[PDB]
Design a protein around this ligand. Structure first.
Ligand code: OTQ
Length: 416
């Protein structure tokens, strides 16, 4: 279950407690300078809530870069402590390690109600469970090593707040080994769980999945899992040409073709029929004579097909008109994939109309969730993030969740 997890807002006893908070501070750092502070800014509602509620100590644990289980100062979290301090308007204590008596002494000696950032968790092979030493030899933590490290992290505080949904798909020590009585989601994790639970667990129906992207192969697990949940599914973008070729022997010219994924198309269609799911593939396409925004273009239907040396780059006008009834009649929408080469403005029309229809359905009461990177990029480029119910920032964890995979960091939270 996703929606029955204890959240930071449910936690009554915070005043005077040492609160351990797992955060996502995996930010790009160039010569000690943080190039993108968004992940740090995103944690401010969690930190402020714990400050306002009077926690004795706010102890932040995280990782960044690729230390691979040994201390590698290239991936030190020291600059993050400086940046966070500036954003909070107070000094953030930075510690050289994340476990041990010295760390415990420094935390206890620190000013009441203050924020402490401990060193990169992944400097310890026990965080990921395996790594590579400096020489390049594979290293592995034994069961006992793992248990010791997790007991050392548990000893840091009294209450655990997991605000790193982006790592919750990993069975890592800070995700599954912090055995405090209260283990609750932070504000970021809380919103991720609340909206994915709304979408996948007893949703307001019809439930629609809008899938898109270049290939079929990397989306097989996602499609098959969503066919167990949804009422309707739009399949678009570059992956649609493989479907058109297999199902209708449509000529696709030089359009993308997924050789390995083509072998699975019938299984997917057979599963949608078995699950009583309505599939909506495009029936026309905007075709180009070159892979370029300034190519000569025209619209071709799925009956005409695509001539040799031409390529389909976006859904056609009839396909776009077909989105209206499908999207506007849906009460829950999970969108994971643009419907064309949106990076090229002339091939963005299908994805933009899809976005406008999703916004309209949301305004009328539908719950809209945007899953991954490219769709999130389109929403950001169009400046419409405030018009979608939830735009996930979970990256790999969001994709695993939608594929129906177990999220060990979510499983490890306390129940409500
Ligand atoms: O790299 C490519 N991706 C695009 C793509 C992604 C999504 C869609 N869509 O049509 O929606 O098409 N389509 C083609 S043709 C093509 C390429 C791509 C590479 C060079 C040869 C011709």
């Amino acid at each position: 279950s996703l929606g029955n997890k204890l959240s930071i807002t449910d936690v009554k006893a915070i005043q005077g407690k040492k609160v351990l908070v797992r955060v996502d501070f995996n930010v790009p750092i160039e010569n000690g300078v943080i190039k993108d502070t968004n992940r740090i800014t995103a944690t401010l509602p969690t930190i402020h809530h714990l400050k306002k509620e009077g926690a004795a100590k706010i102890i932040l644990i995280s990782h960044c870069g690729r230390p691979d289980g040994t201390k590698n100062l290239k991936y030190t979290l020291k600059p993050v402590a400086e940046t966070l301090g500036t954003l909070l308007g107070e000094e953030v204590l930075f510690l050289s390690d994340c476990v041990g008596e010295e760390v415990a002494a420094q935390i206890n000696q620190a000013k009441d109600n203050s924020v402490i950032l401990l060193e990169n968790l992944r400097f310890h092979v026990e965080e990921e469970g395996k790594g590579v030493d400096a020489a390049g030899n594979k290293i592995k933590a034994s069961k006992e090593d793992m248990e010791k490290f997790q007991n050392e992290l548990t000893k840091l505080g009294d209450v655990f707040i997991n605000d790193a949904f982006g790592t919750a798909h990993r069975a890592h020590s800070s995700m599954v080994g912090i055995k405090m009585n209260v283990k609750a989601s932070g504000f970021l994790m809380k919103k991720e769980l609340e909206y994915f639970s709304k979408a996948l667990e007893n949703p307001q129906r019809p439930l629609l999945a809008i899938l898109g992207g270049a290939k079929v192969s990397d989306k097989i697990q996602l499609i098959k899992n969503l066919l167990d949940k949804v009422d309707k599914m739009i399949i678009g973008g570059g992956m649609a040409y493989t479907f058109k070729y297999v199902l209708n022997n449509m000529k696709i010219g030089d359009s993308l073709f997924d050789e390995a994924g083509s072998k699975i198309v019938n299984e997917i269609m057979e599963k949608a029929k078995a699950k009583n799911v309505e599939i909506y593939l495009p029936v026309d396409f905007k075709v180009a004579d070159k892979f370029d925004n300034n190519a000569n273009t025209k619209v071709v239907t799925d009956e005409e097909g695509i001539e040799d040396k031409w390529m389909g780059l976006d859904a056609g006008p009839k396909s776009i008109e077909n989105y209206k009834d499908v999207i506007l009649s849906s009460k829950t929408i999970i969108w994971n994939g643009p419907q064309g080469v949106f990076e090229m403005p002339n091939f963005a029309k299908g994805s933009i109309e899809c976005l406008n229809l999703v916004i309209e359905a949301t305004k009328k009461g539908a719950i809209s969730i945007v899953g991954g990177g490219d769709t999130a990029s389109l929403v950001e480029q169009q400046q419409k993030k405030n018009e979608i119910s939830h735009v996930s920032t979970g990256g790999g964890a969001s994709l695993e969740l939608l594929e129906g995979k177990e999220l060990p960091g979510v499983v490890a939270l306390s129940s409500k």
